[PDB]
Amino acid sequence: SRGELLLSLCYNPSANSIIVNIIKARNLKAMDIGGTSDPYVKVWLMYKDKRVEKKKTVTKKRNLNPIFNESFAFDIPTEKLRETTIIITVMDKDKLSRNDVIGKIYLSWKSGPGEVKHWKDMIARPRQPVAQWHQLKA
Ligand SMILES: [Ca+2]
Ligand SMILES: [Ca+2]
Ligand SMILES: [Ca+2]
Ligand SMILES: [Ca+2]
């Protein structure tokens, strides 16, 4: 159990855009020896197996329940929706080694049940932000 992340998705087909809001996380795994992590969240837009664009939040120091409230806009033509995946990875920044992966969420029509439900809800509710909590998976 790696933690959970609360995020919203808002897709506007007329503008060919999605807004991904990384809201907050809870109960993150501690990936530093003293019982904390320094979390930031990266958001990768994929088209088929290609990386299109990457965005990331600030880093919160020594915080297993960070609150971000950061909003990221991506261009996504309606014609590319079926081939789109949004991969969200919560990371632990480290000074003296490679940053550690806390966990990931994959958003598309071909992911886990909660993820697919959130994606379909976004599609069904154009221009409405839809927020859900997801379990982070290693
Ligand atoms: Ca670490
Ligand atoms: Ca760290
Ligand atoms: Ca490390
Ligand atoms: Ca590093």
Numbering used by the authors: 266 to 403
What text comes from the article?
We describe the crystal structure of the Ca2+-bound synaptotagmin-7 C2B domain at 1.44 Å resolution, which is very similar to that of the synaptotagmin-1 C2B domain. Apart from this expected difference, the structure of the synaptotagmin-7 C2B domain is very similar to the crystal structure of the synaptotagmin-1 C2B domain. The r.m.s. deviation between 713 common atoms of the synaptotagmins-7 and -1 C2B domain is 0.71 Å, which is comparable to differences observed between structures of a given protein in different crystal forms. We observed three Ca2+ ions bound at the cup shape formed by the top loops of the synaptotagmin-7 C2B domain (loops 1–3). The three Ca2+ ions bound at the cavity formed by the top loops are coordinated by five aspartate and one serine side chains, as well as by three backbone carbonyl groups (the Ca2+-binding sites are numbered 1–3 as is common for C2 domains). In contrast, the C2B domain of synaptotagmin-1 was found to bind only two Ca2+ ions due to the absence of the serine side chain in loop 3 that helps to coordinate the third Ca2+ ion in the synaptotagmin-1 C2A domain (S235) and the synaptotagmin-7 C2B domain (S362). Note that this serine residue of loop 3 is not generally conserved in synaptotagmin C2B domains and hence binding of the third Ca2+ ion is an unusual feature of the synaptotagmin-7 C2B domain compared to other isoforms. We also observed a fourth Ca2+ ion bound outside of this region, but this site is not common in C2 domains and the Ca2+ ion is coordinated by only three protein ligands, suggesting that occupation of this site is due to the high Ca2+ concentration present in the crystallization conditions (20 mM) and is not physiologically relevant.
